Amino acid sequence: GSDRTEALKRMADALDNYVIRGVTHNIALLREVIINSRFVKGDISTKFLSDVYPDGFKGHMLTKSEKNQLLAIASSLFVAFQLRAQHFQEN
Amino acid sequence: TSVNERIENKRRTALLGGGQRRIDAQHKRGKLTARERISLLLDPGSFVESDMFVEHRCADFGMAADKNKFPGDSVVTGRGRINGRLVYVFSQDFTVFGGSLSGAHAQKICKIMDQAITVGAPVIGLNDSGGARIQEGVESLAGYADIFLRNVTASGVIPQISLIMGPCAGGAVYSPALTDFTFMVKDTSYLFITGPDVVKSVTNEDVTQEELGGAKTHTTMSGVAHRAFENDVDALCNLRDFFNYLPLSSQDPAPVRECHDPSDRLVPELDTIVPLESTKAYNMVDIIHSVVDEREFFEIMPNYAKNIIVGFARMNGRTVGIVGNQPKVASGCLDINSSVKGARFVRFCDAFNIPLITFVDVPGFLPGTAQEYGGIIRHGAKLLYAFAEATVPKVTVITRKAYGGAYDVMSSKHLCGDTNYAWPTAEIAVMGAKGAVEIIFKGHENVEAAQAEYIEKFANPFPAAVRGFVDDIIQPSSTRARICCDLDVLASKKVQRPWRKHANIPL
Numbered sequence: 001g002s003d004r005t006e007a008l009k010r011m012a013d014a015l016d017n018y019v020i021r022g023v024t025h026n027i028a029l030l031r032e033v034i035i036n037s038r039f040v041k042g043d044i045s046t047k048f049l050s051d052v053y054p055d056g057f058k059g060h061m062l063t064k065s066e067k068n069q070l071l072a073i074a075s076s077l078f079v080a081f082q083l084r085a086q087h088f089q090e091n
Numbered sequence: 092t093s094v095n096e097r098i099e100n101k102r103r104t105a106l107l108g109g110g111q112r113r114i115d116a117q118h119k120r121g122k123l124t125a126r127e128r129i130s131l132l133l134d135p136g137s138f139v140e141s142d143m144f145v146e147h148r149c150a151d152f153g154m155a156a157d158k159n160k161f162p163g164d165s166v167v168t169g170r171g172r173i174n175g176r177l178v179y180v181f182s183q184d185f186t187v188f189g190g191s192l193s194g195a196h197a198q199k200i201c202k203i204m205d206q207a208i209t210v211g212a213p214v215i216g217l218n219d220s221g222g223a224r225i226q227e228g229v230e231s232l233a234g235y236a237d238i239f240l241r242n243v244t245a246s247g248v249i250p251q252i253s254l255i256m257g258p259c260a261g262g263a264v265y266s267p268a269l270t271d272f273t274f275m276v277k278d279t280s281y282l283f284i285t286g287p288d289v290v291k292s293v294t295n296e297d298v299t300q301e302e303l304g305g306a307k308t309h310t311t312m313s314g315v316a317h318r319a320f321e322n323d324v325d326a327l328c329n330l331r332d333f334f335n336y337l338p339l340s341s342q343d344p345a346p347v348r349e350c351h352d353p354s355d356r357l358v359p360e361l362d363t364i365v366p367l368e369s370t371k372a373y374n375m376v377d378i379i380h381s382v383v384d385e386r387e388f389f390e391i392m393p394n395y396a397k398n399i400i401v402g403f404a405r406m407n408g409r410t411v412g413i414v415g416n417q418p419k420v421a422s423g424c425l426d427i428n429s430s431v432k433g434a435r436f437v438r439f440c441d442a443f444n445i446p447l448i449t450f451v452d453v454p455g456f457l458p459g460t461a462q463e464y465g466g467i468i469r470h471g472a473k474l475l476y477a478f479a480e481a482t483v484p485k486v487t488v489i490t491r492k493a494y495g496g497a498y499d500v501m502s503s504k505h506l507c508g509d510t511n512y513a514w515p516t517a518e519i520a521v522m523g524a525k526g527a528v529e530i531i532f533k534g535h536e537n538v539e540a541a542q543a544e545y546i547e548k549f550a551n552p553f554p555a556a557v558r559g560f561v562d563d564i565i566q567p568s569s570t571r572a573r574i575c576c577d578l579d580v581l582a583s584k585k586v587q588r589p590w591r592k593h594a595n596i597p598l
C-alpha cells in the first residue's frame with residue numbers, strides 16, 4: 001500500500017478472505033500479530049513473540065463489542081439457515 | 092361439581108400423566124417425557140392432540156378402580172407440522188403403567204395411521220415400552236396385530252420413521268422392523284425380545300442389558316439400527332433435519348428446496364483423490380462430500396458394514412440417495428453385511444421417487460468360508476435385485492475398479508441405468524490382468540510379453556467404453572456438474588413394466 005496503515009489493513013482483510021481447509025494453518029497467529037499495538041507502533045524485537053505469548057499462543061481475545069457482534073452474527077446466521085429450510089417448491 | 096369443572100380436571104390429569112414423582116424419575120434418568128419430546132419435534136404451536144380423554148375399558152384385576160384411570164392411556168397421539176409440512180406422530184409415555192401396550196393404546200395409534208394413509212402424510216413414532224399389558228391378556232395381542240397390519244399396508248405409501256428412545260421388549264420390537272428407518276439413543280435405548288433374565292434361564296451364558304440389546308450393538312454389529320444419537324435433545328434435532336429430506340407420500344416427487352450452491356461449479360479437488368497405484372486405498376467420503384450441495388451429507392449406519400456407504404444428500408436442491416464403495420475397508424469388496432444395507436436403502440429411495448447416485452469401486456467379493464457358509468450367494472442377490480427393479484433415475488460413476496460380477500451388482504448400465512460415467516482411472520474387466528493372462532496364456536512361451544500386451548490394451552477404461560458400457564469418460568472435476576444436468580432431465584422419466592401381483596426378491 002501507499003502507507004504503513006494501508007498495507008496493514010489490506011493484510012488484515014486478505015487473511016480473513018483467505019480460505020484454507022483440510023489442514024491446520026497459522027492464520028490466527030498472523031491475524032493477531034499484525035494488529036498488535038506493539039507491531040503497529042513498531043516496538044518489535046527478535047524475541048517479540050516470546051514476550052507477548054509467554055505461555056503459548058491462545059487465540060484472539062474478544063472485547064465487549066466484538067463478543068456482541070459475534071453473537072449477533074452467529075444468531076442471525078443460525079436463523080438464516082432455519083428460514084431457508086422452510087422454502088419448498090409448491091406441492 | 093359442574094360438567095366444566097370435571098373437564099378441566101381431566102385435562103390437567105392427562106397433561107401430568109403418571110404423576111410428578113414418576114416424571115421426576117424420568118428426568119433423574121436423563122430422559123424427557125413423551126409430551127416434552129413432541130414439543131421439541133414439531134413446529135411450535137402446530138401440534139393437535141387427539142383422543143386425550145380415552146381410558147381403558149378393562150375391569151379385571153382391580154383395573155376398574157379409579158386409581159388406575161389415567162386419561163390418555165400411556166400414549167400421546169396427534170398431528171402437526173415440521174417446517175410447515177404435515178406429519179402425524181405418536182410417542183409412548185413410560186410414566187403410565189410402564190408404557191405397556193393396552194388394547195386402547197394400540198387403537199389410538201392405529202387411528203392416526205389410518206388418517207396418515209388417507210391424506211398422504213408421514214408417520215414418526217417415538218418408542219418406549221416394556222411390552223404388553225398382561226392385565227388385559229389377549230387384547231394387547233390384538234393391539235399388536237392391528238398395528239402390524241397398518242405398518243405393512245403403509246409400506247411404499249408413506250415413509251415410516253421410528254426413533255427408539257428407551258427400552259423396548261416383547262411384540263413392540265417388530266414395529267421398527269416394519270418401518271423404513273430405525274434410530275436409537277446411545278446408552279439410553281434398548282431393543283430386545285426377552286430380557287437377560289430369560290437368556291440366563293435358557294442357556295448358561297452371562298449377559299447384561301447393554302450387551303443384550305444396547306444401541307451400540309444394533310448400530311455396530313447386528314445391523315438393525317440405522318444410527319444412534321448421543322441424547323434425547325440431539326436425537327430430535329437431527330430427526331427434524333432428516334425429516335426435511337423425504338417426501339410426504341410416494342405419490343410426491345422428491346422434495347426440491349431452495350439452494351444457493353451453483354449447480355455448474357467445478358470441483359478440482361476430485362482429480363487427484365484416486366491414486367495411480369492399485370494397492371493404495373483412498374477415502375470415498377471425500378468424493379461424496381465434495382459433490383453434494385454445500386458439502387452436507389447424511390450418513391446412515393456409519394459403524395456397520397463400513398465397506399459400503401449409503402446416505403442422503405441434496406444436489407441442486409433435490410433430495411438424492413447416494414450409494415458407493417469404501418475402498419478404505421476390506422479393499423472395497425462386497426460381503427453379506429454390505430449387501431443387506433445396500434438393498435434396503437436402494438429399495439426405499441426407489442419407492443419414494445428419490446434418484447440414485449452410485450460411486451463404484453469394487454474389486455469383487457470377500458472370499459472365504461465365513462461368507463460362503465453364510466449364504467453370500469443368497470445375500471448378494473439382494474443388492475443386484477434392488478438396483479435392477481428400480482425405476483427412478485440412476486446415475487453411476489466408476490472411479491477405479493469394477494471386476495467380475497460385482498460390476499453388474501453395483502448398478503451397471505445394463506440394469507436399465509440412465510447414465511454411466513468413468514473416470515480416467517476406471518478399469519472394467521472380468522478379473523485383473525495377472526489372473527486373466529495366466530489363464531488365457533497357459534503353457535506358451537514368452538508369457539511376459541503377453542502380460543505387457545494385455546495390460547496395455549485392457550487395463551484401462553476403453554474396452555468397456557467402446558462397447559457402450561460407459562457413456563463418457565470425464566475429468567473428475569466435472570463430475571458434479573454432469574450429475575446435476577442428468578438429474579434435472581431424468582426427473583420426469585417414466586418406464587413401463589409388466590403387471591405383477593407383487594415383487595419376489597430372493598430374500
Ligand SMILES: *C(=O)CCCC[C@@H]1SC[C@@H]2NC(=O)N[C@@H]21
Binds near residue numbers: 458
Ligand atoms: C490373492 O490371491 C487374494 C486375491 C483376493 C483379491 C480380491 S479379494 C475379493 C475378490 N475376489 C477375488 O478372487 N479377488 C478379489
